[PDB]
Amino acid sequence: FVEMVDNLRGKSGQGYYVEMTVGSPPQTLNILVDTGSSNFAVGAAPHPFLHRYYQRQLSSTYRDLRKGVYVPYTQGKWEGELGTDLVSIPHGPNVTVRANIAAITESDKFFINGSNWEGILGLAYAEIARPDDSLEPFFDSLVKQTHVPNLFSLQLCGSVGGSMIIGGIDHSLYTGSLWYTPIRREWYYEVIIVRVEINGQDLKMDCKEYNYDKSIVDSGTTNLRLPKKVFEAAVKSIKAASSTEKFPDGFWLGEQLVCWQAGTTPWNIFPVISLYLMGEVTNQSFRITILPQQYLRPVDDCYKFAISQSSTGTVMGAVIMEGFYVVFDRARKRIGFAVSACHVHDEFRTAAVEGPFVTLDMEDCGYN
Numbered sequence: 557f558v559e560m561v562d563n564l565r566g567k568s569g570q571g572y573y574v575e576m577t578v579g580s581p582p583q584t585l586n587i588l589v590d591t592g593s594s595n596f597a598v599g600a601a602p603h604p605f606l607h608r609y610y611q612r613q614l615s616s617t618y619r620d621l622r623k624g625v626y627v628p629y630t631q632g633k634w635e636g637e638l639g640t641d642l643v644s645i646p647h648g649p650n651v652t653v654r655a656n657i658a659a660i661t662e663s664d665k666f667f668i669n670g671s672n673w674e675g676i677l678g679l680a681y682a683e684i685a686r687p688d689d690s691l692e693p694f695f696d697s698l699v700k701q702t703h704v705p706n707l708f709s710l711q712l713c714g715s716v717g718g719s720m721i722i723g724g725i726d727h728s729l730y731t732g733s734l735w736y737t738p739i740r741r742e743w744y745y746e747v748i749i750v751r752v753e754i755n756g757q758d759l760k761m762d763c764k765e766y767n768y769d770k771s772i773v774d775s776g777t778t779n780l781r782l783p784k785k786v787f788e789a790a791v792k793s794i795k796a797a798s799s800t801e802k803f804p805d806g807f808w809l810g811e812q813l814v815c816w817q818a819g820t821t822p823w824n825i826f827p828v829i830s831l832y833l834m835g836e837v838t839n840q841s842f843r844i845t846i847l848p849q850q851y852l853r854p855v856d857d858c859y860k861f862a863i864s865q866s867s868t869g870t871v872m873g874a875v876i877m878e879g880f881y882v883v884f885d886r887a888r889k890r891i892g893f894a895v896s897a898c899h900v901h902d903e904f905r906t907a908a909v910e911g912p913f914v915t916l917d918m919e920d921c922g923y924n
């Protein structure tokens with residue numbers, strides 16, 4: 557699928573986007589790729605931060621749906637006007653579909669001043685689509701209206717780059733074997749984590765903990781976010797493996813940045829981290845392992861701590877995704893992980909995907 561290879565750009569900390577076109581003739585926009593949301597939504601007014609925006613009056617295929625949408629985030633809020641128009645992805649399959657568009661007419665703390673994107677492509681399911689499940693998401697319009705197979709894969713390469721392969725997989729982007737975890741239910745890309753090790757040390761928690769109340773795969777979130785009760789323990793252990801050097805008790809966020817002279821970065825006082833994921837077969841699991849490199853983000857070389865808490869559940873943000881090629885195999889209701897060809901890896905230890913493991917009572921790990 558060489559046409560689609562390297563079709564993502566970005567800057568550290570500012571997200572991964574793909575170029576799309578909207579309306580007739582096409583208007584070109586950069587659009588953030590987010591697997592943790594389900595609306596396609598673009599700037600539609602001259603917000604000053606925006607390099608460009610969808611100008612509906614210039615498109616003959618635009619059709620008004622005469623309905624509004626209001627999407628608060630955690631911090632990031634937008635409001636827009638629903639319509640539909642002709643959408644296409646230059647570095648994607650050679651098709652065009654009529655999809656839903658939320659013309660963003662007002663927003664607070666959503667756009668990033670200095671970024672080079674103007675929109676968001678929500679790749680999750682109708683169930684979490686705003687205003688409600690009737691608003692069909694982009695990918696579902698894609699598949700229903702063309703021959704494009706019901707699947708996509710992401711390689712996010714941590715100025716950033718990567719690939720979104722729409723409709724398939726490209727073997728050039730990973731090594732070894734793909735391992736697959738079921739999508740527990742189609743709303744977010746929900747999965748079940750069944751064991752967590754730090755440096756190989758289990759945290760011997762109840763595994764219902766690791767998924768309280770969700771575990772999810774989300775390209776639109778920077779961090780590995782862990783549930784309150786899990787975050788606490790994770791922290792204690794990673795803080796314990798790391799006690800060669802002290803650090804502010806607030807830096808284990810969040811609340812500060814940490815620093816070492818460039819090259820002085822203390823890589824190894826940090827443990828690799830492992831999530832075991834439910835496998836395809838009863839009582840079988842597999843693990844994904846990431847480096848401190850993945851969860852220590854460049855912001856003198858000052859890094860942030862990419863793990864954090866959530867009353868939301870686990871969020872396998874880009875901290876996770878950067879180590880792997882992730883295949884969203886909607887057709888078979890499963891997600892696949894393979895070691896990424898582009899992940900950042902030193903010479904002492906690299907990211908890994910391995911199995912099979914035996915693990916009992918995996919069903920018991922799904923919070924209900």
Ligand SMILES: C[C@@H](NC(=O)c1cc(C(=O)N[C@@H](Cc2ccccc2)[C@H](O)CNC2CC2)cc(N(C)S(C)(=O)=O)c1)c1ccccc1
Pocket residue numbers: 568569570571572588590592593629630632666774775776777778779781864873874
């Ligand atoms: C842009 C940046 N995202 C961020 O840096 C960032 C974004 C979000 C955020 O909420 N992202 C949105 C999409 C969304 C995307 C962009 C703007 C608004 C909404 C996404 O739909 C969230 N999905 C959750 C509802 C399940 C959340 C956080 N976390 C709270 S955090 C501090 O724990 O990591 C960080 C980023 C950087 C690199 C890679 C990916 C994303």
Ligand SMILES: [Cl-]
Pocket residue numbers: 640654655656692697
């Ligand atoms: Cl439609």
